[PDB]
């Protein structure tokens, strides 16, 4: 990991920015993955899958 060390860990300002980006992108990726699992486990149960949606007299 010394190649990555020489680029990110050398300065604490860069290391702090790396942590900020990792929290930003990492949380977005986990959020996307959780939503994919949520959709796959609940097929046909969402509000968008109501057959008579928009057809109330």
């Amino acid at each position: 990991f010394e190649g990555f060390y020489k680029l990110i860990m050398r300065r604490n300002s860069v290391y702090v920015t790396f942590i900020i980006a990792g929290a930003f992108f990492g949380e977005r990726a986990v959020d996307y993955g959780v939503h994919k699992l949520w959709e796959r486990n609940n097929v046909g149960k969402r509000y968008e899958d109501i057959s008579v949606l928009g057809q109330r007299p």
Partner: peptide, 28 residues
């Protein structure tokens, strides 16, 4: 001449954190 680089490096971190706490993607 490393205090200036320290300021620029910390300015990027402050900018990166600001876009991280407040995420104004729907405003830009």
């Amino acid at each position: 001449t490393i205090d200036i680089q320290a300021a620029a490096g910390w300015g990027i971190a402050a900018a990166a954190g600001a876009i991280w706490v407040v995420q104004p993607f729907g405003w830009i």
